[PDB]
Amino acid sequence: IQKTPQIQVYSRHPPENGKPNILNCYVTQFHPPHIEIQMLKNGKKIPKVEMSDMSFSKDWSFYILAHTEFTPTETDTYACRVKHDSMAEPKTVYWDRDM
Amino acid sequence: GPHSMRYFETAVSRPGLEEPRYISVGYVDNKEFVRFDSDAENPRYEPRAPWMEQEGPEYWERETQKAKGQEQWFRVSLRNLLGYYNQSAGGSHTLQQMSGCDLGSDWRLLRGYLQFAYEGRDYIALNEDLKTWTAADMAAQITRRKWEQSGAAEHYKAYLEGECVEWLHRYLKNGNATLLRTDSPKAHVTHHPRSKGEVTLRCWALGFYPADITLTWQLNGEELTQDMELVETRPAGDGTFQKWASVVVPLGKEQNYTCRVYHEGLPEPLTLRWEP
Amino acid sequence: SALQNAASIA
């Protein structure tokens, strides 16, 4: 049995177009632990992405917190794509300053 | 307040180059403080918090040894489980273990914890008495039987009531720059056009720790536990956490809606409403 | 400090 990852994209601090920040991609509730996580900026993959270390919670499920620096703007669109066995095709979820 | 220490251990197998990867993360008050990864260049429990850095080789050596010990145990239990479930070779499997102890606000023991999981499912766990087991399924029965005829439960009962508590005290005594502390959630609501004459209020809780927390919306004293929008609490990445709840409120009737934010670090629950 | 499991394995 497997378990479909719950993805969440959000900034560390309140987004303020122009001001720096951190964009987190929180993938959770998945299993097995093997998982691929890319963070995107306008469709292109962001290079130096911090990936937390394998962890799991009481319900035996793993979770990773990938993150990276970024400066929100009206123009730029950010997203996170997650590859994993419990899914046939990748999942991409886009950032949303209000969420 | 209360405290605890847990050691989450995972052993995960893949095909080909046998020898599963073994990982052990330990926490004190659910804060990572030590980590071991058989995949490292030089496997060995590393300190994972400024404070824990004051331990000294004698310690790390002794721990790393124990981790080397667990590694083997998992390595083999894994081959056995493989046979129990009649799973064909060349697969990829997971053995998980949670062990540890809880303390009251007085620092005395309150409970021991020792449970196992195979493939992510409950396998066998030590009951509260620390004397009896519980086998989730038939394969676990075999395991349970074997573990009873060997009184292996006593062995764990000794550790959980002793060493676990003895060391937690020690740890608690050293690291005292965040463990004897928590962060209170700051709050605020936001207005969002949502439809025809309607809108959405978002009760936001930010920069709080620990992660346990509760949000609720009220319309005339009664809690709106339906049509409300949550979001699993998530790490801000700095150590604190965030979460938010929302509802669809007919524009103009904003004030008739309030949300309370319940959280331990908070003197008293917070009360919020849209501020135009 | 780490727990060491019983000699009794899975």
Coordinates of N, CA, C and O in Angstrom, one line a residue, chain B residues 95-194:
Chain B
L95 N 10.5 -0.9 7.8 CA 10.3 -1.2 9.2 C 10.4 0.0 10.0 O 11.5 0.7 9.9
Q96 N 9.4 0.4 10.8 CA 9.5 1.5 11.6 C 9.3 1.3 13.1 O 8.5 0.4 13.4
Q97 N 10.0 2.1 13.9 CA 9.9 1.9 15.3 C 9.8 3.2 16.1 O 10.6 4.0 15.9
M98 N 8.8 3.3 17.0 CA 8.7 4.5 17.9 C 8.9 4.1 19.3 O 8.2 3.2 19.7
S99 N 9.9 4.7 20.0 CA 10.1 4.3 21.4 C 10.4 5.5 22.2 O 11.0 6.5 21.7
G100 N 10.1 5.5 23.5 CA 10.3 6.7 24.3 C 9.4 6.8 25.5 O 8.7 5.9 25.8
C101 N 9.5 8.0 26.2 CA 8.8 8.1 27.5 C 8.2 9.5 27.7 O 8.8 10.4 27.2
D102 N 7.1 9.6 28.4 CA 6.5 11.0 28.7 C 6.6 11.4 30.2 O 6.6 10.5 31.1
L103 N 6.8 12.7 30.4 CA 6.9 13.2 31.8 C 5.9 14.2 32.2 O 5.5 15.0 31.3
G104 N 5.4 14.2 33.4 CA 4.5 15.2 33.9 C 5.2 16.5 34.0 O 6.3 16.7 33.7
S105 N 4.4 17.5 34.5 CA 5.0 18.8 34.8 C 5.9 18.8 35.9 O 6.7 19.7 36.2
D106 N 5.9 17.6 36.6 CA 6.7 17.3 37.8 C 8.0 16.6 37.4 O 8.8 16.3 38.3
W107 N 8.1 16.2 36.2 CA 9.2 15.4 35.6 C 9.1 13.9 35.9 O 10.1 13.2 35.6
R108 N 8.1 13.5 36.6 CA 8.0 12.0 36.9 C 7.4 11.3 35.6 O 6.8 11.9 34.7
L109 N 7.7 10.0 35.5 CA 7.2 9.3 34.3 C 5.7 9.3 34.3 O 5.0 9.6 35.3
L110 N 5.2 9.0 33.1 CA 3.7 9.0 32.9 C 3.4 7.9 32.0 O 2.3 7.3 32.1
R111 N 4.3 7.6 31.1 CA 4.0 6.5 30.2 C 5.2 6.2 29.4 O 6.1 7.0 29.2
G112 N 5.3 4.9 29.0 CA 6.4 4.4 28.2 C 5.8 4.2 26.8 O 4.6 4.1 26.7
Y113 N 6.6 4.2 25.8 CA 6.1 4.0 24.4 C 7.0 3.1 23.7 O 8.2 3.4 23.6
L114 N 6.5 2.1 23.1 CA 7.3 1.2 22.2 C 6.3 0.6 21.2 O 5.5 -0.3 21.6
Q115 N 6.3 1.0 20.0 CA 5.5 0.4 19.0 C 6.2 0.2 17.6 O 7.1 1.0 17.3
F116 N 5.8 -0.8 16.9 CA 6.4 -1.1 15.6 C 5.5 -1.0 14.4 O 4.3 -1.0 14.6
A117 N 6.0 -0.8 13.2 CA 5.1 -0.7 12.1 C 5.8 -1.3 10.9 O 7.1 -1.1 10.7
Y118 N 5.1 -2.1 10.1 CA 5.7 -2.7 8.9 C 4.9 -2.3 7.8 O 3.7 -2.4 7.8
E119 N 5.6 -1.7 6.8 CA 5.0 -1.2 5.6 C 4.2 0.0 5.9 O 3.3 0.4 5.1
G120 N 4.3 0.6 7.0 CA 3.5 1.8 7.4 C 2.3 1.4 8.2 O 1.5 2.3 8.6
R121 N 2.1 0.1 8.4 CA 0.9 -0.3 9.2 C 1.4 -0.8 10.6 O 2.5 -1.2 10.7
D122 N 0.5 -0.7 11.5 CA 0.7 -1.1 12.9 C 1.1 -2.6 12.8 O 0.5 -3.4 12.1
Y123 N 2.2 -3.0 13.6 CA 2.6 -4.3 13.5 C 2.4 -4.9 14.9 O 1.7 -5.9 15.1
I124 N 3.1 -4.3 15.9 CA 3.0 -4.8 17.3 C 3.5 -3.7 18.1 O 4.4 -3.0 17.8
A125 N 2.7 -3.5 19.2 CA 3.1 -2.4 20.2 C 3.0 -2.8 21.6 O 2.1 -3.7 22.0
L126 N 3.8 -2.3 22.5 CA 3.8 -2.6 23.9 C 2.6 -1.8 24.5 O 2.4 -0.6 24.1
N127 N 1.9 -2.5 25.3 CA 0.7 -1.8 25.9 C 1.2 -0.9 27.0 O 2.4 -0.9 27.3
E128 N 0.3 -0.1 27.6 CA 0.6 0.8 28.7 C 1.3 0.1 29.9 O 2.1 0.7 30.6
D129 N 0.8 -1.1 30.2 CA 1.4 -1.8 31.3 C 2.9 -2.1 31.1 O 3.6 -2.3 32.1
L130 N 3.3 -2.1 29.9 CA 4.7 -2.4 29.6 C 5.0 -3.9 29.9 O 6.1 -4.3 30.0
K131 N 3.9 -4.6 30.0 CA 4.0 -6.1 30.3 C 3.4 -6.9 29.2 O 3.8 -8.1 29.0
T132 N 2.4 -6.4 28.5 CA 1.7 -7.1 27.4 C 1.7 -6.5 26.1 O 1.9 -5.3 26.0
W133 N 1.6 -7.3 25.0 CA 1.6 -6.8 23.7 C 0.2 -6.7 23.0 O -0.8 -7.0 23.6
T134 N 0.3 -6.4 21.7 CA -0.9 -6.2 20.9 C -0.5 -6.5 19.4 O 0.2 -5.7 18.9
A135 N -0.9 -7.6 18.9 CA -0.4 -7.9 17.5 C -1.5 -7.5 16.5 O -2.6 -8.2 16.4
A136 N -1.3 -6.5 15.7 CA -2.2 -6.0 14.7 C -2.7 -7.1 13.7 O -3.8 -6.9 13.2
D137 N -1.9 -8.1 13.4 CA -2.4 -9.2 12.5 C -1.8 -10.5 12.7 O -1.0 -10.7 13.7
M138 N -2.1 -11.5 11.9 CA -1.6 -12.8 12.1 C -0.1 -13.0 12.1 O 0.5 -13.7 12.9
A139 N 0.6 -12.3 11.2 CA 2.1 -12.3 11.1 C 2.6 -11.8 12.5 O 3.6 -12.3 13.0
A140 N 2.0 -10.7 13.0 CA 2.4 -10.1 14.3 C 2.2 -11.1 15.4 O 2.8 -10.9 16.5
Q141 N 1.2 -12.0 15.3 CA 0.9 -13.0 16.4 C 2.2 -13.7 16.6 O 2.7 -13.8 17.7
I142 N 2.8 -14.4 15.5 CA 4.0 -15.1 15.6 C 5.0 -14.3 16.4 O 5.6 -14.7 17.3
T143 N 5.2 -13.0 15.9 CA 6.1 -12.2 16.6 C 5.7 -12.0 18.1 O 6.6 -12.3 18.9
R144 N 4.5 -11.7 18.3 CA 4.1 -11.5 19.7 C 4.4 -12.8 20.5 O 5.1 -12.7 21.6
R145 N 4.0 -14.0 20.1 CA 4.3 -15.2 20.8 C 5.8 -15.3 21.1 O 6.2 -15.3 22.3
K146 N 6.6 -15.2 20.1 CA 8.1 -15.3 20.3 C 8.6 -14.3 21.3 O 9.5 -14.6 22.1
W147 N 8.0 -13.1 21.4 CA 8.4 -12.1 22.3 C 7.9 -12.3 23.7 O 8.4 -11.7 24.7
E148 N 6.9 -13.1 23.9 CA 6.4 -13.4 25.2 C 7.2 -14.5 25.8 O 7.7 -14.3 27.0
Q149 N 7.4 -15.6 25.1 CA 8.2 -16.7 25.6 C 9.7 -16.2 26.0 O 10.4 -17.0 26.6
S150 N 10.0 -15.0 25.6 CA 11.4 -14.5 25.9 C 11.4 -13.4 26.9 O 12.4 -12.8 27.1
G151 N 10.2 -13.0 27.4 CA 10.0 -11.9 28.3 C 10.7 -10.6 27.8 O 10.9 -9.7 28.6
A152 N 10.9 -10.5 26.5 CA 11.5 -9.3 25.9 C 10.8 -8.0 26.3 O 11.4 -6.9 26.3
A153 N 9.6 -8.1 26.8 CA 8.8 -6.9 27.2 C 9.5 -6.4 28.5 O 9.6 -5.1 28.6
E154 N 10.0 -7.2 29.4 CA 10.7 -6.7 30.6 C 11.8 -5.8 30.2 O 12.0 -4.7 30.6
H155 N 12.6 -6.3 29.2 CA 13.8 -5.6 28.7 C 13.4 -4.2 28.3 O 14.1 -3.2 28.7
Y156 N 12.3 -4.0 27.6 CA 11.9 -2.7 27.2 C 11.3 -2.0 28.4 O 11.5 -0.7 28.5
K157 N 10.7 -2.7 29.3 CA 10.1 -2.0 30.4 C 11.2 -1.4 31.3 O 11.0 -0.3 31.9
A158 N 12.3 -2.0 31.3 CA 13.5 -1.5 32.1 C 14.0 -0.2 31.5 O 14.1 0.8 32.2
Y159 N 14.2 -0.2 30.2 CA 14.7 1.0 29.5 C 13.7 2.2 29.6 O 14.1 3.3 30.0
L160 N 12.5 1.9 29.3 CA 11.5 3.0 29.3 C 11.3 3.6 30.6 O 10.9 4.8 30.7
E161 N 11.4 2.8 31.7 CA 11.1 3.4 33.0 C 12.4 4.0 33.6 O 12.4 4.9 34.4
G162 N 13.5 3.5 33.1 CA 14.8 4.0 33.6 C 15.6 4.9 32.8 O 15.4 6.1 32.8
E163 N 16.5 4.3 32.0 CA 17.4 5.1 31.1 C 16.7 6.2 30.4 O 17.1 7.4 30.4
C164 N 15.5 5.9 29.8 CA 14.8 6.9 29.1 C 14.6 8.1 30.0 O 14.9 9.2 29.7
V165 N 14.0 7.8 31.2 CA 13.7 8.9 32.1 C 15.0 9.6 32.7 O 15.0 10.8 32.8
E166 N 16.0 8.8 33.0 CA 17.2 9.3 33.5 C 17.8 10.2 32.5 O 18.2 11.4 32.9
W167 N 17.9 9.8 31.3 CA 18.5 10.7 30.3 C 17.7 11.9 29.9 O 18.3 13.0 29.7
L168 N 16.4 11.8 29.9 CA 15.6 12.9 29.5 C 15.8 14.0 30.6 O 16.0 15.2 30.2
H169 N 15.9 13.7 31.8 CA 16.1 14.7 32.9 C 17.4 15.4 32.5 O 17.5 16.6 32.5
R170 N 18.5 14.6 32.3 CA 19.8 15.1 31.9 C 19.6 16.1 30.8 O 20.0 17.3 30.9
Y171 N 19.0 15.7 29.7 CA 18.9 16.5 28.5 C 18.2 17.8 28.8 O 18.6 18.9 28.5
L172 N 17.0 17.7 29.6 CA 16.2 18.8 30.0 C 17.1 19.8 30.8 O 16.9 21.0 30.6
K173 N 17.9 19.3 31.6 CA 18.8 20.1 32.4 C 19.8 20.9 31.6 O 20.0 22.1 31.8
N174 N 20.4 20.3 30.6 CA 21.3 21.0 29.7 C 20.6 22.0 28.8 O 20.6 23.2 29.1
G175 N 20.1 21.6 27.7 CA 19.4 22.5 26.8 C 18.2 23.2 27.5 O 17.2 22.6 27.7
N176 N 18.4 24.5 27.9 CA 17.4 25.3 28.5 C 17.3 26.7 27.9 O 17.3 27.7 28.6
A177 N 17.2 26.7 26.5 CA 17.2 28.0 25.7 C 16.1 27.9 24.7 O 16.2 28.5 23.6
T178 N 15.0 27.1 24.9 CA 13.9 26.9 24.0 C 13.0 25.8 24.5 O 11.8 25.8 24.1
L179 N 13.6 24.9 25.3 CA 12.8 23.7 25.8 C 11.9 24.2 27.0 O 10.9 23.7 27.2
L180 N 12.4 25.2 27.7 CA 11.7 25.8 28.9 C 11.0 27.0 28.2 O 11.0 28.1 28.8
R181 N 10.5 26.9 27.0 CA 9.9 27.9 26.2 C 9.1 27.5 25.1 O 9.2 26.4 24.5
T182 N 8.1 28.3 24.7 CA 7.2 28.1 23.6 C 6.9 29.5 23.0 O 7.2 30.5 23.6
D183 N 6.3 29.5 21.8 CA 5.9 30.8 21.1 C 4.4 30.9 21.0 O 3.8 29.9 20.6
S184 N 3.9 32.0 21.3 CA 2.4 32.3 21.3 C 2.1 32.7 19.9 O 2.7 33.6 19.3
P185 N 1.0 32.2 19.3 CA 0.5 32.5 18.0 C 0.0 34.0 17.9 O -0.8 34.4 18.7
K186 N 0.4 34.7 16.9 CA 0.0 36.1 16.6 C -1.2 35.8 15.7 O -1.1 34.9 14.9
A187 N -2.2 36.7 15.8 CA -3.4 36.4 14.8 C -3.9 37.6 14.1 O -3.5 38.8 14.4
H188 N -4.7 37.4 13.1 CA -5.4 38.4 12.3 C -6.2 37.8 11.2 O -6.0 36.7 10.8
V189 N -7.2 38.6 10.8 CA -8.1 38.1 9.7 C -7.9 38.9 8.4 O -7.4 40.0 8.4
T190 N -8.3 38.3 7.3 CA -8.2 38.9 6.0 C -9.4 38.8 5.2 O -10.1 37.8 5.1
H191 N -9.7 39.9 4.4 CA -10.9 40.0 3.6 C -10.6 39.5 2.2 O -9.7 40.0 1.6
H192 N -11.5 38.6 1.7 CA -11.3 38.1 0.3 C -12.6 38.1 -0.4 O -13.5 37.3 0.0
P193 N -12.7 38.8 -1.5 CA -14.0 38.8 -2.3 C -14.1 37.3 -2.7 O -13.2 36.7 -3.1
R194 N -15.3 36.7 -2.5 CA -15.5 35.3 -2.8 C -16.6 35.0 -3.9 O -16.5 34.0 -4.5

